[PDB]
Design a protein around this motif. Sequence first.
Motif, PDB file in Angstrom:
ATOM      1  N   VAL A  14       7.139   1.314 -13.088  1.00 43.62           N
ATOM      2  CA  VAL A  14       8.013   0.274 -12.492  1.00 43.62           C
ATOM      3  C   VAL A  14       9.462   0.781 -12.386  1.00 43.62           C
ATOM      4  CG1 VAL A  14       9.046  -2.079 -12.654  1.00 43.62           C
ATOM      5  CG2 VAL A  14       6.698  -1.707 -13.410  1.00 43.62           C
ATOM      6  N   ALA A  17       9.616   3.185  -9.436  1.00 40.72           N
ATOM      7  CA  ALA A  17       9.582   2.400  -8.184  1.00 40.72           C
ATOM      8  C   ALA A  17      10.945   1.688  -7.876  1.00 40.72           C
ATOM      9  CB  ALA A  17       8.398   1.364  -8.235  1.00 40.72           C
ATOM     10  N   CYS A  25       7.630   2.326  -0.003  1.00 40.26           N
ATOM     11  CA  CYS A  25       7.276   0.895   0.099  1.00 40.26           C
ATOM     12  C   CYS A  25       6.237   0.723   1.217  1.00 40.26           C
ATOM     13  CB  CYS A  25       8.541   0.050   0.381  1.00 40.26           C
ATOM     14  SG  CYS A  25       9.598  -0.203  -1.112  1.00 40.26           S
ATOM     15  N   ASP A  26       5.115   0.051   0.927  1.00 41.13           N
ATOM     16  CA  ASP A  26       4.070  -0.243   1.945  1.00 41.13           C
ATOM     17  C   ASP A  26       4.024  -1.734   2.401  1.00 41.13           C
ATOM     18  OD1 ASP A  26       3.125  -0.774  -0.677  1.00 41.13           O
ATOM     19  OD2 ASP A  26       1.025  -0.817  -0.012  1.00 41.13           O
ATOM     20  N   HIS A  39       6.685  -2.413  -3.025  1.00 42.67           N
ATOM     21  CA  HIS A  39       5.461  -1.616  -3.316  1.00 42.67           C
ATOM     22  C   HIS A  39       4.332  -2.615  -3.673  1.00 42.67           C
ATOM     23  CE1 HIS A  39       8.016   2.095  -3.617  1.00 42.67           C
ATOM     24  NE2 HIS A  39       8.847   1.313  -4.304  1.00 42.67           N
ATOM     25  N   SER A  40       3.280  -2.700  -2.833  1.00 39.73           N
ATOM     26  CA  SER A  40       2.187  -3.656  -3.081  1.00 39.73           C
ATOM     27  C   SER A  40       1.640  -3.541  -4.497  1.00 39.73           C
ATOM     28  CB  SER A  40       1.039  -3.491  -2.053  1.00 39.73           C
ATOM     29  OG  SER A  40       0.436  -2.245  -2.238  1.00 39.73           O
ATOM     30  N   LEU A  41       1.560  -2.306  -5.028  1.00 44.27           N
ATOM     31  CA  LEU A  41       1.046  -2.032  -6.378  1.00 44.27           C
ATOM     32  C   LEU A  41       1.890  -2.673  -7.487  1.00 44.27           C
ATOM     33  CD1 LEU A  41      -1.078  -0.608  -8.474  1.00 44.27           C
ATOM     34  CD2 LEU A  41       0.448   1.527  -8.310  1.00 44.27           C
ATOM     35  N   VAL A  42       3.203  -2.535  -7.377  1.00 42.58           N
ATOM     36  CA  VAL A  42       4.122  -3.239  -8.319  1.00 42.58           C
ATOM     37  C   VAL A  42       3.893  -4.783  -8.297  1.00 42.58           C
ATOM     38  CG1 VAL A  42       6.620  -3.624  -8.925  1.00 42.58           C
ATOM     39  CG2 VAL A  42       5.804  -1.287  -8.339  1.00 42.58           C
ATOM     40  N   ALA A  44       1.209  -6.515  -7.327  1.00 39.84           N
ATOM     41  CA  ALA A  44      -0.129  -6.795  -7.895  1.00 39.84           C
ATOM     42  C   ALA A  44      -0.101  -6.840  -9.439  1.00 39.84           C
ATOM     43  CB  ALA A  44      -1.139  -5.715  -7.380  1.00 39.84           C
ATOM     44  N   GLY A  45       0.790  -6.037 -10.017  1.00 44.27           N
ATOM     45  CA  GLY A  45       0.932  -5.972 -11.470  1.00 44.27           C
ATOM     46  C   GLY A  45       1.531  -7.227 -12.102  1.00 44.27           C
ATOM     47  N   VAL A  46       2.115  -8.095 -11.298  1.00 48.93           N
ATOM     48  CA  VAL A  46       2.762  -9.331 -11.807  1.00 48.93           C
ATOM     49  C   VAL A  46       2.074 -10.601 -11.276  1.00 48.93           C
ATOM     50  CG1 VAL A  46       4.834 -10.679 -11.662  1.00 48.93           C
ATOM     51  CG2 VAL A  46       5.087  -8.272 -12.097  1.00 48.93           C
ATOM     52  N   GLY A  51       0.064  -9.195  -4.424  1.00 45.96           N
ATOM     53  CA  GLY A  51      -0.472  -7.807  -4.226  1.00 45.96           C
ATOM     54  C   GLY A  51      -1.207  -7.596  -2.899  1.00 45.96           C
ATOM     55  N   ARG A  52      -0.455  -7.469  -1.817  1.00 44.16           N
ATOM     56  CA  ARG A  52      -0.986  -7.294  -0.444  1.00 44.16           C
ATOM     57  C   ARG A  52      -0.049  -6.388   0.387  1.00 44.16           C
ATOM     58  NH1 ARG A  52      -0.135 -13.474   1.845  1.00 44.16           N
ATOM     59  NH2 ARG A  52      -0.747 -14.159  -0.282  1.00 44.16           N
ATOM     60  N   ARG A  53      -0.620  -5.541   1.235  1.00 36.51           N
ATOM     61  CA  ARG A  53       0.200  -4.532   1.934  1.00 36.51           C
ATOM     62  C   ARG A  53       0.619  -5.050   3.322  1.00 36.51           C
ATOM     63  NH1 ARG A  53      -4.913  -0.476   1.939  1.00 36.51           N
ATOM     64  NH2 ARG A  53      -4.516   0.238   4.114  1.00 36.51           N
TER      65      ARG A  53
ATOM     66  N   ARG B  12       0.219   0.839 -18.039  1.00 37.66           N
ATOM     67  CA  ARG B  12      -0.471  -0.380 -17.546  1.00 37.66           C
ATOM     68  C   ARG B  12      -0.644  -0.387 -16.028  1.00 37.66           C
ATOM     69  NH1 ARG B  12       1.841  -4.336 -14.659  1.00 37.66           N
ATOM     70  NH2 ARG B  12       4.102  -4.286 -14.510  1.00 37.66           N
ATOM     71  N   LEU B  13       0.379   0.055 -15.289  1.00 39.70           N
ATOM     72  CA  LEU B  13       0.242   0.108 -13.822  1.00 39.70           C
ATOM     73  C   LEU B  13      -0.701   1.214 -13.374  1.00 39.70           C
ATOM     74  CD1 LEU B  13       1.416  -1.985 -11.766  1.00 39.70           C
ATOM     75  CD2 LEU B  13       3.289  -0.397 -11.332  1.00 39.70           C
ATOM     76  N   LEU B  16      -4.212  -0.271 -13.839  1.00 41.59           N
ATOM     77  CA  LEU B  16      -4.488  -1.204 -12.744  1.00 41.59           C
ATOM     78  C   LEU B  16      -4.816  -0.466 -11.447  1.00 41.59           C
ATOM     79  CD1 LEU B  16      -4.742  -4.141 -11.586  1.00 41.59           C
ATOM     80  CD2 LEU B  16      -2.173  -3.942 -11.047  1.00 41.59           C
ATOM     81  N   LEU B  20      -8.288  -0.529  -9.129  1.00 46.25           N
ATOM     82  CA  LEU B  20      -8.214  -0.940  -7.700  1.00 46.25           C
ATOM     83  C   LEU B  20      -8.746   0.049  -6.671  1.00 46.25           C
ATOM     84  CD1 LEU B  20      -4.728  -2.799  -7.575  1.00 46.25           C
ATOM     85  CD2 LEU B  20      -7.030  -3.930  -7.374  1.00 46.25           C
ATOM     86  N   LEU B  24      -5.380  -1.025  -1.734  1.00 41.48           N
ATOM     87  CA  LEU B  24      -3.867  -0.816  -1.716  1.00 41.48           C
ATOM     88  C   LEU B  24      -3.403   0.635  -1.603  1.00 41.48           C
ATOM     89  CD1 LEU B  24      -2.499  -3.537  -4.134  1.00 41.48           C
ATOM     90  CD2 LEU B  24      -2.882  -3.832  -1.660  1.00 41.48           C
ATOM     91  N   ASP B  26      -2.143   3.836   0.001  1.00 41.68           N
ATOM     92  CA  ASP B  26      -1.377   4.147   1.239  1.00 41.68           C
ATOM     93  C   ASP B  26      -1.441   5.645   1.671  1.00 41.68           C
ATOM     94  OD1 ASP B  26       0.179   4.641  -1.082  1.00 41.68           O
ATOM     95  OD2 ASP B  26       2.054   4.698   0.075  1.00 41.68           O
ATOM     96  N   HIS B  39      -2.699   6.239  -4.250  1.00 44.06           N
ATOM     97  CA  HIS B  39      -1.443   5.441  -4.221  1.00 44.06           C
ATOM     98  C   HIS B  39      -0.259   6.436  -4.308  1.00 44.06           C
ATOM     99  CE1 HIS B  39      -3.855   1.721  -5.081  1.00 44.06           C
ATOM    100  NE2 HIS B  39      -4.491   2.491  -5.962  1.00 44.06           N
ATOM    101  N   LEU B  41       2.759   6.112  -4.942  1.00 39.16           N
ATOM    102  CA  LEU B  41       3.585   5.820  -6.123  1.00 39.16           C
ATOM    103  C   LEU B  41       3.038   6.443  -7.412  1.00 39.16           C
ATOM    104  CD1 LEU B  41       6.153   4.369  -7.617  1.00 39.16           C
ATOM    105  CD2 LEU B  41       4.630   2.234  -7.798  1.00 39.16           C
ATOM    106  N   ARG B  53       3.354   9.442   1.615  1.00 33.43           N
ATOM    107  CA  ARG B  53       2.387   8.442   2.108  1.00 33.43           C
ATOM    108  C   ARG B  53       1.643   8.980   3.344  1.00 33.43           C
ATOM    109  NH1 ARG B  53       7.337   4.396   3.417  1.00 33.43           N
ATOM    110  NH2 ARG B  53       6.421   3.714   5.440  1.00 33.43           N
TER     111      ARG B  53
END
Lengths: 109, 109
Positions: A14, A17, A25-26, A39-42, A44-46, A51-53, B12-13, B16, B20, B24, B26, B39, B41, B53
Amino acid sequence: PIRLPSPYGSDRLVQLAARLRPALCDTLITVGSQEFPAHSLVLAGVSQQLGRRGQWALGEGISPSTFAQLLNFVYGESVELQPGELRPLQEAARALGVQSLEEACWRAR
Amino acid sequence: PIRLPSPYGSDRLVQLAARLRPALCDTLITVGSQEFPAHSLVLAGVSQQLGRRGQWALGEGISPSTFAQLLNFVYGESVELQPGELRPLQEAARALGVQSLEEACWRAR
């Protein structure tokens, strides 16, 4: 001001990022007229909901000022707020499923 | 077999992202005929050279079998290898700048 500490400030990916953005960034989230790369991945983590691109528009009476604060929190920055900013941030975090922010807001109130 | 422990199994990321993939992703890295989603990232977190990417081809006498092992290591999985697989993995990790894997290989040798 009121300060909300973010529990994400020490996740190494994080942190990386947060330093990069907008590089790699996607996702592009659109709030009225204003544009926010992410970043869709970041996301998704919260919140699974976020979490969508790709590009999409946020429409729910959420202001660009409020969304900018929610996004900084997600990337590990503490947020500092004026009194009347807390309730709109809490409502944005509820609607977007960012549970850690919703509870920090309700605590500071 | 020889086992190489990965130092990424508790980010943790990264965890995840490993659950996945290919969701997601890219990046698409192409090795001869074979295709590997990733990914950007996650890759950037282990090697600046790999943090890019979009689609690209890897050509340097690196086999799909060897690249699959390097990619699992990066996503937090330990790798288990036959004797003659160590040197090609070490050479792949050197060329792609994955320093943690290069040194694990040279240790097991």
